[PDB]
Structure formats: C-alpha cells, structure tokens
From a paper:
We tested the functional importance of Tyr102 by mutating this residue to an alanine in FrzS-GFP and examining the social motility phenotype of the resulting strain. M. xanthus expressing FrzS-GFP Tyr102Ala failed to undergo normal colony expansion in the S-motility assay. Western blotting analysis showed equal levels of FrzS-GFP Tyr102Ala and wild-type FrzS-GFP in vivo, indicating that the phenotype of the Frz Tyr102Ala variant was not the result of decreased levels of the mutant protein. As these cells move forward over the agar surface, Tyr102Ala FrzS-GFP localizes primarily to the lagging cell pole in a manner highly reminiscent of FrzSΔRec-GFP. The Tyr102Ala mutant crystallized in similar conditions and in the same hexagonal space group as the high-resolution wild-type form. Similarly, no large rearrangements were seen in response to the loss of side-chain volume in the Tyr102Ala mutant. The overall Cα RMSD for the Tyr102Ala and wild-type RD structures was 0.23 Å. In response to this mutation, His92 switched to a more common rotamer that does not present Nδ1 to residue 102 for hydrogen bonding. There were no major structural rearrangements along the α4-β5-α5 face, and the all-atom RMSD for this area was low (0.43 Å). The close similarity of the Tyr102Ala and wild-type RD structures coupled with the loss of S-motility of the mutant suggests that the Tyr102 side chain plays a direct role in FrzS function.
Author numbering: 2 to 123
Write the structure that this text describes.
Amino acid sequence: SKKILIVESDTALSATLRSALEGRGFTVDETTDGKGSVEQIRRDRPDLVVLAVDLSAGQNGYLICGKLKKDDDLKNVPIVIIGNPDGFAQHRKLKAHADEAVAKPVDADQLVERAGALIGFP
C-alpha cells in the first residue's frame, strides 16, 4: 500500500487531487486541520504528505513542513508542497525543507507523477 495525506483547506482542490491519486492506486486521506496535522502524521503514518502553503486559520504549510522536517522520527516522510512558486526558492534555503514543491494552480497529472517518483507507484 502507498498512503498519502493531503493537508489542504481548499476542499474542492483536495477532492480533485485525492481522486486523481486514488485512480492511480494510492490510498489517500485528507485533512483541513493544519494544527492537528503533525500529530495525525505521527499516529497514522503516511508514505507521503501533500501540503498546501495556504492553510486556513493563519497556518502556513511551510511551517508545518518545518515541524515535520525537524522531527527526527517524521523527517523521513517525503513532502510535496503545493502553493505559489514565488516561495519555492526561498524554501530551498532552509535546513528543514520539503522534498519537492509543485505550483498552484496544480497540474493534477504532474502531481501524481511526482508522488510516484518519490514513493513508487503502487
């Protein structure tokens, strides 16, 4: 099994991305709750996280990414950020950063290809 968690408060986008990944054979869960996502990942470990920058409630995805990538037990989980590419180069400068980053508006097919490249197609 290849398990993905989508952390995204845009529920329409999340459903489309979930469906594309599911069609390709991934198991996918979704959460809009950025605050709860790190502990959700700890207790229900996915193979990959798709993480939006623009989260509701003043959260941002690069911060959630940093929390994951600073945790020695969770840092090995690959993360694909989805958001405005104007932030991607700066994020590459951090010690703790996402494995990859894909622009919004998201090309769903390309996101699926990156998932497969990162964790294997199931």
